[PDB]
Amino acid sequence: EGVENRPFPYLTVDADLLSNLRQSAAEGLFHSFDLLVGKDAREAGI
Amino acid sequence: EYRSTVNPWASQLGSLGDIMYNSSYRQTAVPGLYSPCRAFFNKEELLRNNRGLYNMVNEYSQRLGGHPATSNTEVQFVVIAGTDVFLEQPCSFLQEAF
Amino acid sequence: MDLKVVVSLLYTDEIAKMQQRIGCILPLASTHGTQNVQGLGLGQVYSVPDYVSMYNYLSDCTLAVLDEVSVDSLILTKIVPGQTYAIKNKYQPFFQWHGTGSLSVMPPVFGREHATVKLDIVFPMVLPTPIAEEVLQKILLFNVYSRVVMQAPGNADMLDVHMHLGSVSYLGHHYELALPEVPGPLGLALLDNLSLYFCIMVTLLPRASMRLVRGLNLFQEMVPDEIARIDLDDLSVADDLSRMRVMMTYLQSLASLFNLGPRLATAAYSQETLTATCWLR
Amino acid sequence: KFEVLLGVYTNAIQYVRFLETALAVSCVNTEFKDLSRMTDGKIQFRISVPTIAHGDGRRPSKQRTFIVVKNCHKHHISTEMELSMLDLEILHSIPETP
Amino acid sequence: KIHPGVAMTVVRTDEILSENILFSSRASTSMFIGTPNVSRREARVDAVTFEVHHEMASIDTGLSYSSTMTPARVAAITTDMGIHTQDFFSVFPAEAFGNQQVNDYIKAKVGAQRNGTLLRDPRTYLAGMLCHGQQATCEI
Amino acid sequence: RRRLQRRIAGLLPPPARRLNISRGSEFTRDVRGLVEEHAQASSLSAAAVWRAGLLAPGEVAVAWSGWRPPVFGDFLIHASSFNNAEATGTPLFQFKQSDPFSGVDAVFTPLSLFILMNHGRGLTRMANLLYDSPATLADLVPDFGRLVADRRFHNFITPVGPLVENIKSTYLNKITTVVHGPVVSKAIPRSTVKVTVPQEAFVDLDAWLSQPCPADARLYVALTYEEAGPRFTFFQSSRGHCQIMNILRIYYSPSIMHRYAVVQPLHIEELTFGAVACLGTFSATDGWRRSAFNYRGSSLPVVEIDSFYSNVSDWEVIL
């Protein structure tokens, strides 16, 4: 909802930013996010 | 759960409290006074925070989210300037008086 | 550009009286570099005074907002229609200016001693345009309602014409006007012929309002009453022509004077420092 | 009998830098010389979530991946200083007098 | 001082001037400090007026909250937690009773129209628009 | 006598009004000095300030050309009265409030001023979409229906020129309007602002008549009192004010009959039928190019006056 999904080279940081994420996206801390479960969790077509 | 209200003269939708205190606050009102009951009686404020928890925590600190009083005056007025007026307020966050 | 005007002539009280009026404007005789004492405004025209000659002199010659006062010189800057200026309301009839209001330079009706510096530098009253037309109505109708009670005291009550004509209320500010109670008959005062110009305008008007609808529709004949419409129809043609010419001149000149003349236009007033960013318009 | 003056003092306005104070620990800075050109900034996180394999019969969440972006803010500040024209007509001249 | 048939329940509000503690973790946001720009914005014949500009653009580089702000100590309380009930004759000055002589009797028996100088927030009013501190407006 | 020669040596040279060129492809130093205009903003360092010529007295020159700088108006307004998603070049209308020391102003977009005209009885979709509550606009004016009835609404609204800069403030918004002068934007990259007036309110008067081609076609506003409420029509005309009042009486002659027919002027203050004022001059060749104003889901057609010179005047009554 305001997010693009391109096959970017994603820099691999080491932060613990998984903690309280699936509950934080449900309440709406993030203004715009895309949840990709299953086949959508892919480095998309160029 | 053993009763519906402790008074029906203000808790009802069209009661006496919703006669005299449930008024939609506007910045250009002709009295301009500050009523501390308007945080408890506004239907537009009791349903203002029905959005999710983190999106209430976000709008709690980011702005003067609802009904502040003017400090350093003689009588309490509701603010219109808001430039140097920084204050936080839990009474609109949780809707309970002490 | 060069905009300063250095008029050469003060002792300590006259200097200190000039310092209280160091920001307000005054009219200049000529748009030249070095001028003399007489060249400053309203000393040769307001010393019996009338509003029409002061208005003609004020719209005729150029104006200048003064800057500094020396022991012998008065360094003052003329105002041109090009660029913008900063003026201050340091006038003794105090009217609160607001932002983006047309300021009018009207000659002093509130007395000579209110706005003068007797060294005689007579400054003009710079007050906003709705207050200008309101005070002009409330001095003009006061002169009319004083002449009719010097003529016939049973017509108008003096206590009736001082409740309305002694109070101006623009934007909540209530102002009281210093009005002459004894103007004296046969003129000899301020506003004495402008109140007499209006009466010649009003008298020849129903003789001329019928003259155009006879000469030249149905909508224009319903809003007046019938009696003023069908009034005479028979007058001497040369006398009617003379009355028409005098009526037209005293219509056009009076209307150009009811336009307030030299009209400044402020943008940002600041009552913390009493300055208004104005320009000529 | 004279009027001595025993000194004419003034305060030295010490410079304050943002990178000299310790508020700059909480944010990493960058001199971006053309910021007014920028109309929208964006930073994009991709959080590939792991999952526990369960032996009890439950609806199993597959390989999830959150794509949350964060849009930049824009803060434009401006004060207003004044300078007399008499302090500029001398600045744009050349003097031959002490 | 006899009881009426009703029982009023007052509500006040109290300003508590606190002294807060702002924590903010290291390298939370990532600001983009632009360059300062001066712009002439008022050129009158007496004094030209410059308006310098500056633009920054912060962006948070974390996902959860990375700052917190608790009060530490009460510096003072500013409102007298007392009894100043606001009057509805200032809040609703258009409402009135039938008779005028009962109106100016009720407004004389209660403390009606005690002050009318300020009907809006004082800060908004320009320059030159009660000996105690800010009075907490009670509300029955 | 040589010091005075050195003084006049800086005061002699006028701006180059003409320049005999040989080729345009060479782009010489002289034609570059002819075309170059000094900027009103630069980076805050001594080199860029000295090269922009900001410290020069009266005008900008690195160290009279027809270019006068604009004078800006700064208005602290209620943030609920103004919508921040309006266009940059839109004319605003300050209401002279009745309270003596109010520090908050009351400005009005022609969309914001429209829902004063409606409530009490296209644009109305957009004017009701921008302002979800007209009751917070109806109490900015203390007595709107009273002031309209005795025909004193025109001398209480003064136009304050088009908007240029609007900082999005939360409680007490501050807006910047060019109250006189060249309507040019204030921004770090300087760009052009176009005066946006809504199309169903803007009525052209050169085409309503339908060989002398003048240079400047002035823009007029017209607060006129009708039976359905007052109206705000924006007139574009190439002729002077003495011509615009006569042609406005000619244009509104049926509406005077309508207002005399549907109500009767039983009082003396109902005689005035509106008043007009000049909002400023723009070029007649490229003016009033139509565009759109796209809000969230609806778009009203808008007319966009480019290269506007705001110069407002007092109201001239139409009768």
UniProtKB/Swiss-Prot annotation, chain C:
Superkingdom field: Viruses
Coiled coil recorded as keyword: no
GO CC, one annotated term: viral capsid
Signal peptide: none
Keyword Ribosomal protein: no
GO molecular function: structural molecule activity
Primary location class: virion
Subcellular localization(s) per the UniProt record: Virion; Host nucleus
A UniProt-annotated Pfam family: Herpes_V23
UniProt keyword terms in alphabetical order: Capsid protein, Host nucleus, Virion
Subunit record text: Interacts with TRX1 and major capisd protein/MCP.
Functional summary from the UniProt entry: Structural component of the T=16 icosahedral capsid. The capsid is composed of pentamers and hexamers of major capsid protein/MCP, which are linked together by heterotrimers called triplexes. These triplexes are formed by a single molecule of triplex protein 1/TRX1 and two copies of triplex protein 2/TRX2. Additionally, TRX1 is required for efficient transport of TRX2 to the nucleus, which is the site of capsid assembly.
Family the UniProt entry places it in: Belongs to the herpesviridae TRX2 protein family.
Name this protein carries in UniProt: Triplex capsid protein 2
Species this chain originates from: Epstein-Barr virus (strain B95-8)
Lineage: Viruses, Duplodnaviria, Heunggongvirae, Peploviricota, Herviviricetes
From Swiss-Prot, chain D:
Compartments in which it is found: Virion; Host nucleus
Family under the similarity heading: Belongs to the herpesviridae major capsid protein family.
Assembly and oligomerization: Homomultimer. Makes the hexons and eleven out of twelve pentons. Interacts with triplex proteins 1/TRX1 and 2/TRX2; adjacent capsomers are linked together in groups of three by triplexes, heterotrimeric complexes composed of one molecule of TRX1 and two molecules of TRX2. Interacts with scaffold protein; this interaction allows efficient MCP transport to the host nucleus. Interacts with capsid vertex component 2/CVC2. Interacts with the small capsomere-interacting protein/SCP.
Function recorded in the entry: Self-assembles to form an icosahedral capsid with a T=16 symmetry, about 200 nm in diameter, and consisting of 150 hexons and 12 pentons (total of 162 capsomers). Hexons form the edges and faces of the capsid and are each composed of six MCP molecules. In contrast, one penton is found at each of the 12 vertices. Eleven of the pentons are MCP pentamers, while the last vertex is occupied by the portal complex.
Protein name: Major capsid protein
Organism: Epstein-Barr virus (strain B95-8)
Location of this fragment in the whole protein: 51 to 148 of 1381
From Swiss-Prot, chain F:
Gene Ontology molecular function, alphabetical: DNA binding
GO biological process, one term: viral capsid assembly
Compartment(s) where it occurs, according to its Swiss-Prot or TrEMBL record: Virion; Host nucleus
Pfam families membership: Herpes_VP19C (PF03327)
InterPro entries xrefs: Herpes_1
Keyword RNA-binding included in the entry's annotation: no
Main location: virion
Protein's UniProt keywords contain Nucleotide-binding: no
Source taxon at top rank: Viruses
Alphabetic keyword roster: Capsid protein, Host nucleus, Virion
GO cellular component: host cell nucleus; viral capsid
HAMAP family: HSV_TRX1
Purpose of the protein: Structural component of the T=16 icosahedral capsid. The capsid is composed of pentamers and hexamers of major capsid protein/MCP, which are linked together by heterotrimers called triplexes. These triplexes are formed by a single molecule of triplex protein 1/TRX1 and two copies of triplex protein 2/TRX2. Additionally, TRX1 is required for efficient transport of TRX2 to the nucleus, which is the site of capsid assembly.
Subunit structure: Interacts with TRX2, MCP and capsid vertex component 2/CVC2.
Family: Belongs to the herpesviridae TRX1 protein family.
Name recorded for this polypeptide: Triplex capsid protein 1
